[PDB]
Design a protein around this ligand. Structure first.
Ligand SMILES: Oc1ccc2[nH]cc(CN3CCN(c4nc5cc(Cl)ccc5s4)CC3)c2c1
Ligand SMILES: Oc1ccc2[nH]cc(CN3CCN(c4nc5cc(Cl)ccc5s4)CC3)c2c1
Ligand SMILES: [Zn+2]
Ligand SMILES: [Zn+2]
Lengths: 358, 358
């Protein structure tokens, strides 16, 4: 099974990284232990959706391509390593984003920086190490691979797009004309930049490149199958599914109970440009817009409750159902176009969509 | 002149990065302005020692090798780009280290995160962007270069060694046996880990890889001259000069006036494993060791003054002169060994040493 193989490779990669720190970086057993615990706490515990997508794409191609058994094993091992590079990249951005946002919990556990023996001083560096490990994995495991250059190039572009996305996200509540390193940034008062186009740009860069595009294209690279697809369709479908994924996360932040969510959602307090805020502003009357402005982006729980009740009374479920019908329609159309060059790849995309939609 | 060429290339690289953000990353003029100012504030203003070393090494080879004029220009441009990759890598670690350490000033100006319109929330990400830019530079400018693979591999190893070094540095005042993410870390009471061997390990990784090794080897790579040297001698001399550089920085932190230093030095308050603390512990009697333990690593200015006077009365100038005589001796010996394969490269190393020593 794919999951058994995926988790066995984590143990192998972890052992390799820590053994390398001992043999080449003069590490002591106590600092190796700290880094082992850091890796487990930051990398494990999720669903491994991003990493398993690489494995699933590679598995799809194996089913229709002629290979020696040793080659099938090599491809599957490469897909697991590539999938772990993505999981570690996600771990890097979660560690850093939790510090930047002052987050309290992550997956029902405290954020890494909040651990007593960690602190922000160490956590920022731990986050840096997590991303350096993705490169150590690539150069070691893919040293002789024909796809090494393309993989490192794609990984770099995705990482950069994601850092650009975090900038778009953290500054989404400021007026663009006021951005100035010399002047403390006031929250917007007009919310003129809370538009579907601006929200789409935030989401496209902050999450879709690393959550959907990177796993799909990495699965193609380790399979030596990039010629079986039209890359423009891959980008379009990845960006489309990724946006839907984030709209789901925005709604859950506001209404999914903290116990089920695994944290206390603070998007309203943080004045985030969420799908709920953009959509609400897209249908509210003058009175509702005014009430929203007087209560958004403030920590006062009475003000947060006003925003939540404004959203509830605005019937955003109808807009969500309408957005979802449009996404089902467009995703199915792009899947159909993917079948022209690769029915196998289209099938992996269908599975990626099914898992997102539910 | 090398400096004129080096600074002209910064303008070109800056223009390329910002133009790429507009054409491919949907950036708006206000966020491009913020990133332009961030780049200038974090990358410029230093002596450009690391970046200019790449240029100087490449210039040395140009003087003794046959090339068309267009090739000499291509090599010099590659050396400037490679030198800027190192300067931007340094900018990344300064931004992040200033946040981690809670630093106030850097080069007589506030630390980047302390700017009113920046904040830690943005600065951590700005630091991440600074390092992604080093990779954007490499993939763009060195796309067709024979040294691209070796350069990216060397850059990754140096970056990882540096992140490992920051971990060694930030945890240098804890007892290794007590390192535990679950438990808040107490300061050491015995200072048994304040030894010359442990101090050497901190310094080797936290600064010598990126300050000395990377500029020298990058100069060789862009010159296609790695066969003109014995790499083991390059590593040994880089590590040796780098250690001397850091011993100088440790002494200046404690005794160079804040006006000349460009900041208020806090190594004593921070309980850092500095050359002054290790050397003092290496010659103190029982009474002096006891007085050091009762005053080190505390913010109280009276306690800091006791440590500074303990250092002053301990005649650490004699130990420094003795360490310096040994370094002059070993650096000169390694330079002599470098002459066997490349008198030109040995000469660039002599210049690197002269600039460090003064
Ligand atoms: O006033 C409050 C404050 C906090 C609260 N927590 C839970 C509630 C009770 N419901 C409020 C309405 N609701 C919404 N579900 C969606 C789903 C989509 Cl896809 C789009 C818009 C909405 S609106 C579900 C939970 C509540 C009410
Ligand atoms: O008590 C204090 C407190 C703060 C102070 N600031 C300046 C001073 C006055 N001098 C104190 C001694 N000194 C040192 N120079 C070096 C150089 C090396 Cl290489 C190694 C060890 C030392 S010791 C220079 C400045 C002073 C005194
Ligand atoms: Zn965030
Ligand atoms: Zn530091």
């Amino acid at each position: 099974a794919s999951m058994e193989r995926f988790l066995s490779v984590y143990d192998e990669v972890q052992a390799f990284l820590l053994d390398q720190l001992q043999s080449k970086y003069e590490i002591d057993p106590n600092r190796a232990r700290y880094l082992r615990i850091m890796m487990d706490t930051t990398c494990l515990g999720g669903k491994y959706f991003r990493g398993m997508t690489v494995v699933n794409v590679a598995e799809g191609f194996l089913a229709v391509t002629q290979h020696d058994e040793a080659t099938k094993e090599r491809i599957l091992h490469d897909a697991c390593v590539g999938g772990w590079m993505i999981e570690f990249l996600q771990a890097h951005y979660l560690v850093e984003d939790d510090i930047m946002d002052g987050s309290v919990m992550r997956r029902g556990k405290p954020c890494w920086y909040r651990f007593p023996g960690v602190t922000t001083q160490c956590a920022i560096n731990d986050g840096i190490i997590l991303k350096s490990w993705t490169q150590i994995m690539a150069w070691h495991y893919f040293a002789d691979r024909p796809f090494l250059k393309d993989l490192l190039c794609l990984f770099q572009k995705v990482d950069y797009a994601t850092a650009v996305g975090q900038m778009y996200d953290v500054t989404s509540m400021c007026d663009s004309n006021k951005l100035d390193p010399e002047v403390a940034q006031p929250m917007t008062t007009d919310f003129a930049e809370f538009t579907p186009a601006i929200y789409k740009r935030i989401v496209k860069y902050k999450t879709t490149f690393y959550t959907y595009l990177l796993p799909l294209v990495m699965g193609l690279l380790v399979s030596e199958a990039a010629a079986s697809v039209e890359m423009n369709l891959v980008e379009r479908v990845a960006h489309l599914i990724g946006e839907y994924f984030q709209v789901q996360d925005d709604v859950m932040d506001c209404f999914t109970p903290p116990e089920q969510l695994g944290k206390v959602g603070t998007d309203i307090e943080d004045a985030k440009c969420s799908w709920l805020a953009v959509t609400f502003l897209g249908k509210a009357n003058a009175a509702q817009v005014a009430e929203f402005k007087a209560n958004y982006g403030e920590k006062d729980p009475a003000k947060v409750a006003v925003v939540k009740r404004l959203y509830s009374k605005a019937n955003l479920q109808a807009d969500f159902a309408a957005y979802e019908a449009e996404v089902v329609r467009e995703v199915e159309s792009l899947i159909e176009q993917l079948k022209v060059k690769s029915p196998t790849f289209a099938e992996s995309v269908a599975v990626v969509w099914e898992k997102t939609h539910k």
